[PDB]
Amino acid sequence: LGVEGEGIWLALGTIGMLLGMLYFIADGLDVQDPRQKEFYVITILIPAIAAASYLSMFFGFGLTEVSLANGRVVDVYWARYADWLFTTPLLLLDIGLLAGASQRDIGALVGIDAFMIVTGLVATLTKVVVARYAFWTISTISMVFLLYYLVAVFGEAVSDADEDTRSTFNALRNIILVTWAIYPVAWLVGTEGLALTGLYGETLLFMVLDLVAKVGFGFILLRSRAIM
Amino acid sequence: LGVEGEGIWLALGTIGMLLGMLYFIADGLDVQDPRQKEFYVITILIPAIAAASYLSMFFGFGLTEVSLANGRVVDVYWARYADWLFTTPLLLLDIGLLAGASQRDIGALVGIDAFMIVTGLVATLTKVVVARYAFWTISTISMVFLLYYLVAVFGEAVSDADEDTRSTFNALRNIILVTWAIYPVAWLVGTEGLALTGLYGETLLFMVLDLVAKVGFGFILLRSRAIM
Amino acid sequence: LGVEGEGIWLALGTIGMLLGMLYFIADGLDVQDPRQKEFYVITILIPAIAAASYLSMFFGFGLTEVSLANGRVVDVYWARYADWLFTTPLLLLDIGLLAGASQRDIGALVGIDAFMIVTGLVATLTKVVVARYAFWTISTISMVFLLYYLVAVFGEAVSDADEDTRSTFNALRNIILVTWAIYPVAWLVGTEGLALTGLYGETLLFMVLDLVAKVGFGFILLRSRAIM
Ligand SMILES: CCCCCCCC/C=C\CCCCCCCC(=O)OC[C@@H](O)CO
Ligand SMILES: CCCCCCCC/C=C\CCCCCCCC(=O)OC[C@@H](O)CO
Ligand SMILES: CCCCCCCC/C=C\CCCCCCCC(=O)OC[C@@H](O)CO
Ligand SMILES: CCCCCCCC/C=C\CCCCCCCC(=O)OC[C@@H](O)CO
Ligand SMILES: CCCCCCCC/C=C\CCCCCCCC(=O)OC[C@@H](O)CO
Ligand SMILES: CCCCCCCC/C=C\CCCCCCCC(=O)OC[C@@H](O)CO
Ligand SMILES: CCCCCCCC/C=C\CCCCCCCC(=O)OC[C@@H](O)CO
Ligand SMILES: CCCCCCCC/C=C\CCCCCCCC(=O)OC[C@H](O)CO
Ligand SMILES: CCCCCCCC/C=C\CCCCCCCC(=O)OC[C@H](O)CO
Ligand SMILES: CCCCCCCC/C=C\CCCCCCCC(=O)OC[C@H](O)CO
Ligand SMILES: *C/C=C(C)/C=C/C=C(C)/C=C/C1=C(C)CCCC1(C)C
Ligand SMILES: *C/C=C(C)/C=C/C=C(C)/C=C/C1=C(C)CCCC1(C)C
Ligand SMILES: *C/C=C(C)/C=C/C=C(C)/C=C/C1=C(C)CCCC1(C)C
């Protein structure tokens, strides 16, 4: 149920993540090759983690209240950030391995990703209004950098690969660009920021984004000839 | 000492870990070879972390009350999980390096292990009784998988090694299989779950399990010809 | 602001870290080589993390009160530890990469570093006074070992390198030795320990130490011929 009806999206999110996970598992049963197997392992682990995170939220674990200096009280699902701290580096690993990026480049993006998620958690938890928006601005700046780097650095890495790999990379890159860019906007319009929509709407929006970014992304990756 | 006499097991456990650590250190003083030396470092770090966790719990810092949604109050040593989050992947690294497993395979197992421990911690901290059991179930399923994968995947990797190595692997594998499998049982029968035993018994059980899984395991590993 | 005027050192620390970060970014713009580039990425990420930590503290989010069994109430800037938990391994990685230390050796020091930071956080947060000093002692022991291993192990790794690299390594090593050894002394003399100085003096001291250990260190590294 949740605080303001948002439990329905928490439940549907749990289910959607679980089904993606099982589909991926079903799909990888015959995989023998180590590189290919690796893509399965990372891509199954992603919605496992998101499914468990969603379920914990559905049950109200991982839900806090933050009282701002405003007097405003904000209903903060902080378990999302726990989810994000691990699933976003894994997503970056997934596409970096696809791109054939070096270990040092993947590590650089993982470092900037972690920075983005943690500064976003500070934005979400801080009581001081100006600090909320300062950290949201820090985190978004880091996001813009991360995305530019994904395009330029992973794009360069993938440029000497075969056409199947370049086309799959471009698809996955565009999923990241479009869906990841919406998260900070969603934070800003939802209850953590300007409150233009309430918790129910914000929770719906993240559920859709997460599902696209994990199960949609995973679907496109795992069905590609590029990983075989 | 402690809430209901259980501090004695916290103290013995501290001392035990510390003793195992010191012995391990004393044992590796003349080791020059980097691979052999790596086994020492990992196997010394494990009881260090566990000794420090045990000491924190003995002094009460590793201990919190969790009030359930039915009114039951549960006395929770959450420091265990802090310990487990790091020591279980290090133990898996140890035996994986023994087995000659690939980087990919150790990483996969470590991902599943981390998943297991974190969903365990959720099981332990959540206020809703059905959630407690749901997460204990998710974590136990992950464990069964981890243990299956340890046997099939690390066993396959070690199958091409020399006889001493396979023998030491089999001994260490069986220590993991038997001792790790008892932990979900301990949780279920202890105060976190069905409360068949109290805090004193439950603490004794985890002390014995941890000592076997860390110092017993470490002893068997570091004395083998396989690592020299 | 802050508890007792110490926000001025939080503000100057923020600004100091940010300006170091910016300098380093501006300094790395033309870098083509992957190894040189990696040194820039690490050394930019360090003061970015420290600037975000300092700003969070400046706004009051990286601060909590702790009531000791003493009755004494300590104003704890816990976000320092979050910072240190990531920045001290990255510093070790930086110098390790400079030393040409093996992956094993770097991982071993990062292990012991993490142990040192975590046990220091336990020291800072525990209410039982004897426990606070016991953990401070454990953490300091780990630090002395870490510093020794830095000198012996990383010094041996760098002993076959060219003169510029050896000379840069010795400068950076000496920065670590003097500055890092002072942190436990600040904790001891500051409000967490003997309270010989109040929060304002202690905050000032950590600001100075952090700026030398991150921006001073970074400056010396990134201007060296060794990394080119
Ligand atoms: C309602 C939340 C449910 C969350 C998931 C619970 C069940 C899963 C529990 C643990 C799994 C964690 C991730 C485990 C990831 C396993 C990946 C694997 O080994 O697959 C190999 C492929 O080739 C197979 O096709
Ligand atoms: C939620 C955070 C969980 C962190 C778990 C602790 C992480 C640190 C402890 C162990 C990490 C080891 C697993 C990381 C993967 C190590 C694989 C490896 O070392 O391969 C060696 C040779 O086979 C090839 O050169
Ligand atoms: C309330 C949140 C509940 C969910 C928390 C999730 C905790 C994190 C779980 C899993 C983290 C997995 C980290 C481990 C990820 C391993 C990635 C891997 O397979 O690397 C392969 C390389 O070594 C070789 O190419
Ligand atoms: C005011 C609080 C502090 C806010 C700092 C926010 C900084 C966010 C921007 C980036 C995140 C830091 C991680 C940045 C790590 C990558 C930097 C890089 O690749 O530089 C290229 C080199 O060649 C140098 O030119
Ligand atoms: C009270 C709780 C205290 C918890 C403190 C946790 C500190 C330990 C954290 C991480 C330890 C793992 C880091 C060190 C893990 C070993 C690194 C290594 O040897 O890797 C490469 C090789 O495998 C290549 O063959
Ligand atoms: C509750 C948290 C307890 C502490 C866990 C944190 C442990 C440290 C976490 C992140 C450290 C990242 C810094 C960088 C870690 C570098 C890992 C490494 O061994 O690389 C060596 C190779 O590059 C050599 O060629
Ligand atoms: C009142 C307490 C004050 C703080 C006490 C602890 C502060 C740290 C003290 C000393 C830090 C450095 C000690 C360890 C660093 C020296 C190790 C060394 O010299 O090795 C040389 C060999 O490798 C040559 O081949
Ligand atoms: C408020 C506190 C916020 C704290 C948030 C901390 C987030 C970052 C932590 C660890 C990232 C470590 C990532 C490892 C960095 C390696 C970078 C690298 O190897 O780059 C090579 C370069 O790209 C090519 O030459
Ligand atoms: C009572 C609580 C005690 C808690 C712990 C007390 C302090 C332990 C010191 C460092 C932590 C462990 C770090 C170990 C790092 C590896 C050390 C090593 O390299 O040992 C080599 C071995 O002898 C083969 O040569
Ligand atoms: C109440 C219950 C609480 C939880 C109890 C959990 C017990 C799990 C222990 C062992 C099963 C998993 C490990 C063994 C499963 C695989 C055995 C096997 O046949 O592996 C053969 C291998 O594939 C040949 O190469
Ligand atoms: C599977 C989950 C995904 C891919 C989530 C990605 C999340 C982000 C890109 C988060 C972005 C944020 C900002 C850049 C500003 C601060 C608010 C955040 C954390 C929502
Ligand atoms: C050194 C510590 C060791 C080897 C501890 C291992 C711990 C586990 C195998 C924990 C298992 C659990 C379950 C599978 C269900 C949920 C409760 C746990 C975390 C106790
Ligand atoms: C950039 C930040 C740096 C380099 C911080 C270093 C911090 C330490 C060396 C910490 C030392 C501590 C002890 C050894 C005893 C416990 C108190 C600590 C955590 C301050």
mmCIF file of N, CA and C in Angstrom, chain B residues 46-119:
data_model
loop_
_atom_site.group_PDB
_atom_site.id
_atom_site.type_symbol
_atom_site.label_atom_id
_atom_site.label_comp_id
_atom_site.label_asym_id
_atom_site.label_seq_id
_atom_site.Cartn_x
_atom_site.Cartn_y
_atom_site.Cartn_z
ATOM 1 N N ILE B 46 41.005 -11.889 7.345
ATOM 2 C CA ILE B 46 39.721 -12.455 7.779
ATOM 3 C C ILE B 46 39.462 -12.496 9.345
ATOM 4 N N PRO B 47 40.349 -13.158 10.086
ATOM 5 C CA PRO B 47 40.137 -13.111 11.540
ATOM 6 C C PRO B 47 40.452 -11.752 12.126
ATOM 7 N N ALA B 48 41.332 -10.913 11.558
ATOM 8 C CA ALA B 48 41.376 -9.519 12.054
ATOM 9 C C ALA B 48 40.005 -8.778 12.090
ATOM 10 N N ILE B 49 39.316 -8.805 10.961
ATOM 11 C CA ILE B 49 38.001 -8.169 10.814
ATOM 12 C C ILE B 49 37.014 -8.830 11.785
ATOM 13 N N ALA B 50 37.058 -10.163 11.871
ATOM 14 C CA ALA B 50 36.137 -10.828 12.782
ATOM 15 C C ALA B 50 36.443 -10.538 14.256
ATOM 16 N N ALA B 51 37.727 -10.418 14.614
ATOM 17 C CA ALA B 51 38.088 -10.100 15.988
ATOM 18 C C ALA B 51 37.596 -8.704 16.318
ATOM 19 N N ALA B 52 37.813 -7.772 15.396
ATOM 20 C CA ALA B 52 37.362 -6.410 15.643
ATOM 21 C C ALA B 52 35.818 -6.282 15.766
ATOM 22 N N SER B 53 35.086 -7.011 14.912
ATOM 23 C CA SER B 53 33.622 -7.064 15.006
ATOM 24 C C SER B 53 33.194 -7.651 16.348
ATOM 25 N N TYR B 54 33.779 -8.787 16.717
ATOM 26 C CA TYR B 54 33.495 -9.419 17.982
ATOM 27 C C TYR B 54 33.774 -8.455 19.127
ATOM 28 N N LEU B 55 34.896 -7.758 19.122
ATOM 29 C CA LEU B 55 35.180 -6.833 20.241
ATOM 30 C C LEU B 55 34.107 -5.719 20.301
ATOM 31 N N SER B 56 33.703 -5.193 19.132
ATOM 32 C CA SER B 56 32.663 -4.123 19.081
ATOM 33 C C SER B 56 31.372 -4.698 19.692
ATOM 34 N N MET B 57 31.085 -5.963 19.394
ATOM 35 C CA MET B 57 29.831 -6.523 19.903
ATOM 36 C C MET B 57 29.936 -6.770 21.397
ATOM 37 N N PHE B 58 31.133 -7.173 21.845
ATOM 38 C CA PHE B 58 31.359 -7.372 23.269
ATOM 39 C C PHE B 58 31.158 -6.083 24.041
ATOM 40 N N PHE B 59 31.533 -4.957 23.436
ATOM 41 C CA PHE B 59 31.397 -3.709 24.175
ATOM 42 C C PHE B 59 29.992 -3.121 23.995
ATOM 43 N N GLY B 60 29.190 -3.705 23.111
ATOM 44 C CA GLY B 60 27.831 -3.256 22.905
ATOM 45 C C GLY B 60 27.591 -2.355 21.695
ATOM 46 N N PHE B 61 28.641 -1.992 20.987
ATOM 47 C CA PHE B 61 28.433 -1.130 19.848
ATOM 48 C C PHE B 61 27.854 -1.828 18.650
ATOM 49 N N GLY B 62 28.205 -3.083 18.491
ATOM 50 C CA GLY B 62 27.661 -3.898 17.429
ATOM 51 C C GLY B 62 26.245 -4.399 17.726
ATOM 52 N N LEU B 63 25.529 -3.784 18.691
ATOM 53 C CA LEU B 63 24.229 -4.290 19.194
ATOM 54 C C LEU B 63 23.136 -3.206 19.223
ATOM 55 N N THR B 64 22.031 -3.543 18.576
ATOM 56 C CA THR B 64 20.814 -2.741 18.512
ATOM 57 C C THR B 64 19.509 -3.472 18.817
ATOM 58 N N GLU B 65 18.536 -2.763 19.343
ATOM 59 C CA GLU B 65 17.201 -3.311 19.412
ATOM 60 C C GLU B 65 16.355 -3.085 18.126
ATOM 61 N N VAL B 66 15.669 -4.118 17.644
ATOM 62 C CA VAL B 66 14.764 -3.943 16.512
ATOM 63 C C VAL B 66 13.397 -4.253 17.109
ATOM 64 N N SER B 67 12.502 -3.276 17.049
ATOM 65 C CA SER B 67 11.123 -3.477 17.473
ATOM 66 C C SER B 67 10.205 -3.891 16.347
ATOM 67 N N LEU B 68 9.642 -5.087 16.422
ATOM 68 C CA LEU B 68 8.814 -5.550 15.336
ATOM 69 C C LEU B 68 7.398 -4.939 15.367
ATOM 70 N N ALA B 69 6.699 -5.061 14.237
ATOM 71 C CA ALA B 69 5.340 -4.560 14.074
ATOM 72 C C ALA B 69 4.292 -5.307 14.894
ATOM 73 N N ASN B 70 4.645 -6.468 15.440
ATOM 74 C CA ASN B 70 3.812 -7.163 16.421
ATOM 75 C C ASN B 70 4.043 -6.849 17.907
ATOM 76 N N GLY B 71 4.868 -5.853 18.204
ATOM 77 C CA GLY B 71 5.513 -5.732 19.499
ATOM 78 C C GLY B 71 6.713 -6.465 20.047
ATOM 79 N N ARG B 72 7.127 -7.550 19.412
ATOM 80 C CA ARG B 72 8.321 -8.271 19.851
ATOM 81 C C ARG B 72 9.558 -7.389 19.705
ATOM 82 N N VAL B 73 10.415 -7.374 20.703
ATOM 83 C CA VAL B 73 11.653 -6.653 20.596
ATOM 84 C C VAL B 73 12.776 -7.709 20.402
ATOM 85 N N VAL B 74 13.662 -7.476 19.449
ATOM 86 C CA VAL B 74 14.699 -8.434 19.113
ATOM 87 C C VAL B 74 16.017 -7.728 19.317
ATOM 88 N N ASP B 75 16.906 -8.400 20.031
ATOM 89 C CA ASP B 75 18.244 -7.919 20.267
ATOM 90 C C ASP B 75 19.200 -8.389 19.167
ATOM 91 N N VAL B 76 19.622 -7.452 18.339
ATOM 92 C CA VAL B 76 20.241 -7.684 17.057
ATOM 93 C C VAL B 76 21.718 -7.269 17.100
ATOM 94 N N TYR B 77 22.645 -8.212 16.983
ATOM 95 C CA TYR B 77 24.049 -7.868 16.732
ATOM 96 C C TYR B 77 24.258 -7.592 15.244
ATOM 97 N N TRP B 78 24.106 -6.329 14.828
ATOM 98 C CA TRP B 78 24.136 -6.062 13.398
ATOM 99 C C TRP B 78 25.580 -6.022 12.931
ATOM 100 N N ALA B 79 26.537 -5.967 13.865
ATOM 101 C CA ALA B 79 27.954 -5.956 13.454
ATOM 102 C C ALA B 79 28.438 -7.212 12.739
ATOM 103 N N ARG B 80 27.739 -8.321 12.996
ATOM 104 C CA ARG B 80 27.949 -9.595 12.312
ATOM 105 C C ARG B 80 27.945 -9.357 10.812
ATOM 106 N N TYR B 81 26.936 -8.610 10.385
ATOM 107 C CA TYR B 81 26.736 -8.456 8.977
ATOM 108 C C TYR B 81 27.816 -7.585 8.379
ATOM 109 N N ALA B 82 28.238 -6.567 9.141
ATOM 110 C CA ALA B 82 29.372 -5.745 8.728
ATOM 111 C C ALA B 82 30.557 -6.694 8.526
ATOM 112 N N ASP B 83 30.779 -7.564 9.501
ATOM 113 C CA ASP B 83 31.856 -8.538 9.389
ATOM 114 C C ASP B 83 31.663 -9.419 8.120
ATOM 115 N N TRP B 84 30.480 -10.033 8.024
ATOM 116 C CA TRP B 84 30.195 -10.986 6.949
ATOM 117 C C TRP B 84 30.289 -10.422 5.532
ATOM 118 N N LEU B 85 29.878 -9.166 5.388
ATOM 119 C CA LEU B 85 29.941 -8.507 4.083
ATOM 120 C C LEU B 85 31.345 -8.545 3.511
ATOM 121 N N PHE B 86 32.344 -8.423 4.372
ATOM 122 C CA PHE B 86 33.729 -8.483 3.902
ATOM 123 C C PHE B 86 34.464 -9.826 3.987
ATOM 124 N N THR B 87 34.225 -10.571 5.059
ATOM 125 C CA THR B 87 34.929 -11.820 5.287
ATOM 126 C C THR B 87 34.432 -12.959 4.406
ATOM 127 N N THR B 88 33.131 -13.003 4.099
ATOM 128 C CA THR B 88 32.676 -14.073 3.207
ATOM 129 C C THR B 88 33.232 -13.911 1.757
ATOM 130 N N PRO B 89 33.274 -12.676 1.194
ATOM 131 C CA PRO B 89 33.935 -12.604 -0.126
ATOM 132 C C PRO B 89 35.435 -12.931 -0.029
ATOM 133 N N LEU B 90 36.109 -12.512 1.052
ATOM 134 C CA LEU B 90 37.536 -12.850 1.206
ATOM 135 C C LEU B 90 37.723 -14.370 1.320
ATOM 136 N N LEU B 91 36.849 -15.059 2.051
ATOM 137 C CA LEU B 91 36.968 -16.522 2.144
ATOM 138 C C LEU B 91 36.763 -17.094 0.733
ATOM 139 N N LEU B 92 35.799 -16.538 -0.016
ATOM 140 C CA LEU B 92 35.551 -17.091 -1.350
ATOM 141 C C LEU B 92 36.728 -16.821 -2.231
ATOM 142 N N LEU B 93 37.382 -15.681 -2.027
ATOM 143 C CA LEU B 93 38.564 -15.380 -2.813
ATOM 144 C C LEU B 93 39.650 -16.412 -2.481
ATOM 145 N N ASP B 94 39.849 -16.638 -1.171
ATOM 146 C CA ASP B 94 40.852 -17.621 -0.763
ATOM 147 C C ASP B 94 40.748 -18.953 -1.482
ATOM 148 N N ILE B 95 39.551 -19.551 -1.384
ATOM 149 C CA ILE B 95 39.375 -20.870 -1.966
ATOM 150 C C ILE B 95 39.326 -20.776 -3.474
ATOM 151 N N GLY B 96 38.833 -19.640 -3.981
ATOM 152 C CA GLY B 96 38.860 -19.507 -5.423
ATOM 153 C C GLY B 96 40.272 -19.423 -5.983
ATOM 154 N N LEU B 97 41.135 -18.667 -5.292
ATOM 155 C CA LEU B 97 42.522 -18.674 -5.673
ATOM 156 C C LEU B 97 43.185 -20.032 -5.518
ATOM 157 N N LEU B 98 42.868 -20.750 -4.432
ATOM 158 C CA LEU B 98 43.275 -22.164 -4.324
ATOM 159 C C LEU B 98 42.838 -22.972 -5.534
ATOM 160 N N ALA B 99 41.588 -22.783 -5.962
ATOM 161 C CA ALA B 99 41.042 -23.652 -6.996
ATOM 162 C C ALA B 99 41.575 -23.317 -8.405
ATOM 163 N N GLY B 100 42.161 -22.125 -8.557
ATOM 164 C CA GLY B 100 42.641 -21.683 -9.855
ATOM 165 C C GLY B 100 41.410 -21.250 -10.658
ATOM 166 N N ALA B 101 40.398 -20.713 -9.978
ATOM 167 C CA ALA B 101 39.252 -20.147 -10.688
ATOM 168 C C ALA B 101 39.594 -18.846 -11.404
ATOM 169 N N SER B 102 38.875 -18.583 -12.493
ATOM 170 C CA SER B 102 39.107 -17.362 -13.244
ATOM 171 C C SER B 102 38.594 -16.145 -12.457
ATOM 172 N N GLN B 103 39.097 -14.959 -12.811
ATOM 173 C CA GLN B 103 38.605 -13.709 -12.269
ATOM 174 C C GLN B 103 37.084 -13.565 -12.418
ATOM 175 N N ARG B 104 36.598 -13.911 -13.614
ATOM 176 C CA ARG B 104 35.161 -13.892 -13.883
ATOM 177 C C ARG B 104 34.364 -14.736 -12.894
ATOM 178 N N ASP B 105 34.859 -15.938 -12.611
ATOM 179 C CA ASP B 105 34.059 -16.843 -11.776
ATOM 180 C C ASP B 105 34.058 -16.454 -10.291
ATOM 181 N N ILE B 106 35.198 -15.948 -9.830
ATOM 182 C CA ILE B 106 35.281 -15.493 -8.451
ATOM 183 C C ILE B 106 34.381 -14.259 -8.309
ATOM 184 N N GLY B 107 34.478 -13.319 -9.253
ATOM 185 C CA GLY B 107 33.616 -12.163 -9.200
ATOM 186 C C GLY B 107 32.125 -12.508 -9.155
ATOM 187 N N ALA B 108 31.703 -13.454 -10.008
ATOM 188 C CA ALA B 108 30.283 -13.884 -9.989
ATOM 189 C C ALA B 108 29.871 -14.383 -8.595
ATOM 190 N N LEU B 109 30.727 -15.254 -8.035
ATOM 191 C CA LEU B 109 30.385 -15.834 -6.764
ATOM 192 C C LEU B 109 30.328 -14.747 -5.700
ATOM 193 N N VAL B 110 31.274 -13.824 -5.728
ATOM 194 C CA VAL B 110 31.302 -12.718 -4.776
ATOM 195 C C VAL B 110 30.000 -11.824 -4.888
ATOM 196 N N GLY B 111 29.543 -11.556 -6.111
ATOM 197 C CA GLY B 111 28.291 -10.841 -6.331
ATOM 198 C C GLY B 111 27.125 -11.559 -5.646
ATOM 199 N N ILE B 112 27.079 -12.882 -5.826
ATOM 200 C CA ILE B 112 25.990 -13.650 -5.195
ATOM 201 C C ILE B 112 26.111 -13.635 -3.681
ATOM 202 N N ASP B 113 27.354 -13.734 -3.206
ATOM 203 C CA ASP B 113 27.630 -13.684 -1.783
ATOM 204 C C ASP B 113 27.181 -12.369 -1.113
ATOM 205 N N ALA B 114 27.627 -11.252 -1.679
ATOM 206 C CA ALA B 114 27.185 -9.921 -1.241
ATOM 207 C C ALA B 114 25.643 -9.849 -1.225
ATOM 208 N N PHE B 115 24.988 -10.302 -2.311
ATOM 209 C CA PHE B 115 23.510 -10.362 -2.355
ATOM 210 C C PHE B 115 22.911 -11.130 -1.171
ATOM 211 N N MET B 116 23.501 -12.309 -0.914
ATOM 212 C CA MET B 116 23.097 -13.140 0.200
ATOM 213 C C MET B 116 23.170 -12.428 1.579
ATOM 214 N N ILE B 117 24.318 -11.797 1.831
ATOM 215 C CA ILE B 117 24.530 -11.081 3.097
ATOM 216 C C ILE B 117 23.633 -9.837 3.264
ATOM 217 N N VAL B 118 23.523 -9.022 2.229
ATOM 218 C CA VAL B 118 22.671 -7.847 2.318
ATOM 219 C C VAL B 118 21.177 -8.214 2.495
ATOM 220 N N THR B 119 20.678 -9.210 1.753
ATOM 221 C CA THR B 119 19.280 -9.582 1.945
ATOM 222 C C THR B 119 19.105 -10.231 3.311
#
